[PDB]
């Protein structure tokens, strides 16, 4: 039920610094605000210099930190330090015990402070691997034992999005574009489960409608819609969406190869 909302600039600065430090792990701090018990919002990030030793407690640099703080004050960015990013390149997202102790050093600052692990290399143009969570593949380290996972979402202002739109100009390329497949897996599934759901509704309307007059039936059902029209209706989206879905791939395979 608990969650964090990670603004775009945070996420991009994140992945940038991470990808830039490869193949060594980088750390930094997270600026935001705690809405309620159920939420942490992260609007900002700044990057913490390298250390001779690995990412660790003293890697956090007071001088550097406050030195950044005030200079953000002058920009009005004033926020708490709500968590700290990090990266475990190639190793997936989990906290080593050494990650843990530091996480505690951020518990005693604020009890709700969170840990964010980013994984630059295997995060790729598909799904981005990211994780945020706090203490008490990954189960080897006691995913649930010493600590526990959290959830993540992304705040987007209208204008933000509007900038992001113009990145790709798809106006020429449309029609060879194949939309995300997993999404049409939930599509082609939930659609079918639904058709099942209204099947026996159409069954009940044919039996009841059989033994009861139309004038009586209307009184009952006018509230909802004619389950025969959810068959007639719902069959379509599956039909044509799946025919363009098939054809599009049939073309990309033979044409593009």
């Amino acid at each position: 039920k608990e969650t964090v909302y990670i603004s775009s600039i945070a996420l991009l600065k994140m992945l940038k610094h991470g990808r830039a430090g490869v193949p060594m792990e980088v750390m930094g701090l997270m600026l935001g605000e705690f809405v309620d018990d159920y939420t942490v919002n992260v609007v900002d990030v700044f990057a913490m210099p390298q250390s001779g030793t690995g990412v660790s407690v003293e890697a956090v640099d007071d001088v550097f930190q406050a030195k950044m703080m005030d200079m953000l004050k002058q920009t009005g960015r004033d926020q708490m330090v709500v968590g700290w990013y990090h990266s475990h390149p190639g190793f997936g997202c989990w906290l080593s015990s050494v990650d843990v102790n530091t996480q505690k050093s951020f518990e005693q600052l604020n009890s709700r402070a969170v840990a964010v692990v980013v994984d630059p290399i295997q995060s790729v143009k598909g799904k981005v691997v990211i994780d945020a969570f706090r203490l008490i593949q990954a189960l080897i380290h006691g995913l649930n034992r010493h600590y526990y996972s959290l959830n993540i979402d992304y705040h987007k202002t209208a204008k933000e999005t509007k900038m992001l739109m113009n990145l790709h100009k798809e106006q020429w390329q449309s029609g060879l574009k194949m939309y995300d497949y997993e999404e049409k897996e939930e599509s082609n599934l939930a659609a079918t489960k639904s058709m099942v759901k209204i099947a026996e509704q159409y069954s009940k309307r044919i039996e009841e409608e059989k033994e009861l007059t139309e004038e009586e039936l209307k009184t009952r059902y006018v509230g909802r819609q004619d389950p025969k029209k959810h068959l007639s209706e719902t069959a379509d989206e599956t039909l044509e969406n799946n025919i363009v879905s098939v054809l599009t791939a049939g073309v990309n395979s033979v044409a593009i190869k």
């Binding site: 060594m24 001779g52 390149p89």
Partner: protein
């Protein structure tokens, strides 16, 4: 003598609550005595706990910084006994961070080497990588050749 087991039995404590009463020179000093008498005792548990009770930030003071070479040197010896490695390498790292042994070229070589050998013996894992790849880029490591 080996009877320092019998004697040192008492000083496995006597430092305990004298924390604020002693001055850290002497204080820490015979904490270190507790260490080496604990290893020569052949018992690492009190070396371990009697060790960690010191607080590292005392190493802001160059005075105590001169001393702590002993401290880490022991922590090495312990960890070697425990068959830990990555930990050893973190210590040798830390001593290797000392200005005094940063300077002298005849100081930091045999420690730098050991840092290599242990980062080699440690099992592949998280901190092994970035520790290695940091060493990899240390200019001084150029001066060594085979180890390089």
């Amino acid at each position: 003598e080996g009877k320092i087991d019998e004697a040192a039995d008492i000083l496995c404590e006597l430092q305990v609550e004298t924390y604020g009463s002693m001055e850290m020179s002497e204080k820490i000093q015979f904490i270190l005595e507790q260490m080496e008498l604990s290893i020569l005792k052949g018992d690492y548990s009190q070396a371990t706990v009697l060790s960690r009770k010191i607080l590292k930030k005392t190493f802001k003071n160059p005075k105590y910084e001169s001393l702590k070479l002993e401290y880490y040197n022991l922590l090495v010896k312990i960890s070697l006994h425990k068959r830990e490695y990555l930990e050893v390498a973190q210590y040798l790292q830390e001593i290797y961070q000392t200005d005094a042994i940063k300077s002298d070229e005849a100081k930091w070589k045999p420690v730098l080497s050991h840092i290599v050998y242990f980062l080699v013996l440690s099992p592949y894992g998280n901190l092994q990588n970035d520790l290695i790849h940091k060493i990899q880029n240390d200019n001084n490591l150029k001066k060594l050749e085979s180890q390089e």
